């Protein structure tokens, strides 16, 4: 019992400081009441009272004028229904002004925000709103500005928000605006920093192989002033690249780790190589990121940092850690010990366009872990750059670049695919700049898939595939067109795991997750390709169909009652066998008459029954829709690249390819359907609206089967 502690001990246990407790204790009425509150609280908590509940009980004890209601308010604080300062403040406002003493639980609870949840996004938006409101004055006054106004205006929008959450959001958004004061389990639980055993921001020095220089601690101090201790990550695709399923592990890891840890993630385009824009790919990268449910804190480009990358390269030369080389490209470079001043001179000369591509290079001066000598920092390239045009004719290499851009953007967790971490550190430490922690995870790849841009652009060149978005490809944009829901791909990445190696996997494991999302999300409607006309010799002359079968709590849509209904030519048989059959809603429709064409083309049917056979699917007054059915792109379900050594991955082009249906018949439930909307075609499988589908000429894609075995 906390009820048996001396008041000094009790009060420090409730979370008062020693100083506040020794004061409180002089106040007899407050001590007796605070003690009373705590006794009742521990009673109906069956527990020791945590600090947060304690501070509130303190507030209650110190402010409740009307002792009569103490057991009332304590019960709420205990059961955590009142767990916020403005909740307690509102309950106290309510207790004054309600002496009635049978108090209406519902009135009180609503008046005190009892159930109300305030989300981070909400606080984020209230704070952002206040900042915009004051931005000009914020930018000039900088840290002299009254931060009170921001919390003020934020408070006034969020009555029931925790004040510290507001304060923290204001602090952080002000930091991002001002810069430094220079004076299996859930995907998101899986990416908790504590779950993965990743370092806390600013504690890079605890990670393996990290080097603590004489500047490191100061460097991390500066790091924390710039970042405010926030987790920062990056995703760095080429702006002209094509994303595939492996990139989904990357996107979820970098944006997800940021998201799971109150952090930010940079979309940093790797545009170190000057090349013409291909706007379709760029926007597709941006879209795919958004599509899987993430938003870049900021969009940057490696080319933004060309000036600083160059400056740092000059500084490497000055420190004897880089030199200008004339090897063409391993053979020891004749130039690696040339005088520093020759390297300063020729590096400038490289920049001034005095060398042809390949005639000169800048190299770091080290031996790497794998025995590689002197990796290249800079090459001469004269293709105009899409963003800096002809401003540069020298460009940093990939590893040099994104390592030092990580330092520039103060990345806390640089997450990559395998692993030259030793050389990453070498670079930052050679220049004594902030050194982010690099962590390598294992690639993710799928069998029967080819994802090289050069190879994809030639699957499209050779018409084996309709476009780079074609559902037989395993690119991200393709899987979306094929009809996969983002949730599925993410759920897939969640289930595969967090820390592995090159793990080439079988596609059906993913399609598994596609099914499990379309089941709870894709509404059902009926259709078939091989259609037959069926004639009713019988019926009465709007049979409502549910949206989701296993839970009707979703609603229903009306479909036709007319007698001319159509069915599947795969259900209509004459002869007998072991297993077969032959309606879903109306009757049973027994075969009265049977036609036959010139040969054995059964051309129509007559039917007349109502109501125990086997129920099938049909379409009365049908809408005419195109349907595309797809096969496995590569014959070898396993990899096309030559482990099999087929001698050609273009030989493995499996001749089945596409099965186009050319406007068969479908329920009028798929009428107001927009592209990427997904349905269950009630006996065939899951299908989604291809982006070629107007309301006029509707088109569908065969997303996934209902089962495997």
Swiss-Prot record:
UniProt EC number: 6.1.1.18
Subcellular location: Cytoplasm, Cytosol; Cytoplasm
Record-listed N6-acetyllysine modification sites: 276
GO molecular function: ATP binding; glutamine-tRNA ligase activity; protein kinase binding; protein kinase inhibitor activity
Annotated tissue distribution: Highly expressed in fetal cerebral cortex, particularly in the ventricular zone, inner subventricular zone, outer subventricular zone, and cortical plate.
Modified residues annotated as Phosphoserine in this record: 71, 452
Keyword set, alphabetical order: Acetylation, Aminoacyl-tRNA synthetase, ATP-binding, Cytoplasm, Disease variant, Epilepsy, Ligase, Nucleotide-binding, Phosphoprotein, Primary microcephaly, Protein biosynthesis
Entries under PROSITE patterns matching the protein: AA_TRNA_LIGASE_I
Catalytic activity annotation: tRNA(Gln) + L-glutamine + ATP = L-glutaminyl-tRNA(Gln) + AMP + diphosphate
GO cellular component: aminoacyl-tRNA synthetase multienzyme complex; cytoplasm; cytosol; mitochondrial matrix; protein-containing complex
Modified residue annotations for N-acetylalanine: 3
UniProt record similarity statement: Belongs to the class-I aminoacyl-tRNA synthetase family.
Protein name: Glutamine--tRNA ligase
Species for this entry: Homo sapiens
Gene expressing this chain: QARS1
């Amino acid at each position: 019992h906390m009820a048996a502690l001396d008041s000094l001990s009790l009060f420090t246990s409730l979370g008062l400081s020693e100083q506040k407790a020794r004061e409180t204790l002089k106040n007899s009425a407050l001590s007796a009441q605070l003690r009373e509150a705590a006794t009742q609280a521990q009673q109906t908590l069956g527990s020791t009272i945590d600090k947060a509940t304690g501070i509130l009980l303190y507030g209650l004890a110190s402010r409740l004028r009307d002792t009569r209601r103490l057991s009332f308010l304590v019960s709420y604080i205990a059961s955590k229904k009142i767990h916020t300062e403005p909740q307690l403040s509102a309950a106290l406002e309510y207790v004054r002004s309600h002496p009635l003493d049978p108090i209406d639980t519902v009135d009180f609870e609503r008046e005190c925000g009892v159930g109300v949840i305030v989300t981070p996004e909400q606080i984020e938006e209230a704070v952002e709103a206040a900042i915009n409101r004051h931005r000009p004055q914020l930018l000039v006054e900088r840290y002299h500005f009254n931060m009170g106004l921001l919390m003020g205006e934020a408070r006034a929008v969020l009555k029931w928000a925790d004040g510290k959450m507001i304060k923290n959001e204001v602090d952080m958004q002000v930091l991002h605006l001002l810069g430094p004061k220079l004076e299996t389990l859930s995907l998101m639980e899986q990416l908790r920093g504590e779950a993965l055993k990743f370092h806390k921001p600013g504690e890079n020095y605890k990670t393996p192989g990290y080097v603590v220089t004489p500047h490191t601690m100061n460097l991390l101090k500066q790091h924390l002033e710039i970042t405010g201790g926030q987790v920062r990550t990056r995703f760095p695709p080429e702006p002209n690249g094509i994303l595939h399923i492996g990139h989904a592990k990357a996107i979820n890891f970098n944006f997800g780790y940021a998201k799971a840890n109150n952090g930010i993630c940079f979309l940093r385009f790797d545009d170190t190589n000057p090349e013409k824009e291909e706007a379709k790919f760029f926007t597709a990268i941006c879209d795919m990121v958004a599509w899987l449910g993430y938003t870049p804190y900021k969009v940057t480009y490696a080319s933004d940092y060309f000036d600083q990358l160059y400056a740092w390269a000059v500084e490497l030369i000055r420190r004897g850690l880089a030199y200008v080389c004339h090897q063409r490209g391993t053979l020891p470079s004749p130039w690696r010990d040339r005088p520093m001043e020759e390297s300063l001179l020729l590096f400038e000369a490289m920049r001034k366009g005095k060398f042809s591509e390949g005639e000169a290079t800048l190299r770091m001066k080290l031996v790497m872990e794998d025995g590689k000598m002197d990796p290249v920092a800079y090459r001469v390239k004269y293709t105009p750059h899409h963003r800096t045009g002809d401003k540069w004719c020298i460009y940093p290499t990939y590893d040099y670049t994104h390592c030092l851009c990580d330092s520039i953007e103060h990345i806390t967790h640089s997450l990559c695919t395998k692993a030259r971490r030793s050389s990453y550190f070498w670079l930052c430490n050679a220049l004594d700049v902030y050194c982010p922690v690099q962590w390598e995870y294992g690639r993710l790849n799928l069998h029967y898939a080819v994802v090289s841009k050069r190879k994809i652009l030639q699957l499209v060149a050779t018409g084996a595939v309709r476009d780079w978005d074609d559902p037989r490809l395993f690119t991200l944009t393709a899987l979306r067109r094929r009809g996969f829901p983002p949730e599925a791909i993410n759920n897939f990445c969640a289930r595969v795991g967090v820390t592995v190696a090159q793990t080439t996997m079988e596609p059906h494991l993913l399609e598994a997750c596609v099914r499990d999302v379309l089941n709870d999300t894709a509404p059902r409607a009926m259709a078939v390709l091989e259609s037959l006309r069926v004639i009713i010799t019988n019926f009465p002359a709007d049979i409502q169909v549910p949206n989701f079968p296993a839970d009707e709590t979703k609603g229903f849509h009306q479909v036709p009652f007319a007698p001319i209904v159509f069915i599947e030519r795969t259900d209509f048989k004459e002869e007998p066998e072991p297993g077969f059959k032959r309606r879903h809603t109306g009757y049973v429709i027994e075969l009265q008459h049977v036609v036959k064409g010139p040969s054995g083309c059964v051309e129509s049917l007559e039917v007349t029954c109502r109501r125990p056979k086997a129920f099938i699917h049909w379409v009365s007054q049908p809408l005419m829709c195109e349907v595309r059915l797809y096969e496995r792109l590569f014959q070898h379900k396993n990899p096309e690249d030559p482990t099999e050594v087929p001698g050609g991955f273009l030989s493995d082009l499996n001749l089945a390819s596409l099965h186009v249906v050319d406007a068969a018949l479908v329920d009028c439930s798929v009428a107001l359907a927009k592209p990427f909307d997904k349905f269950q075609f009630e006996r065939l499988g899951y299908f989604s609206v291809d982006p070629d589908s107007h309301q006029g000429k509707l088109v569908f894609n065969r997303t996934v089967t209902l089962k495997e075995d």
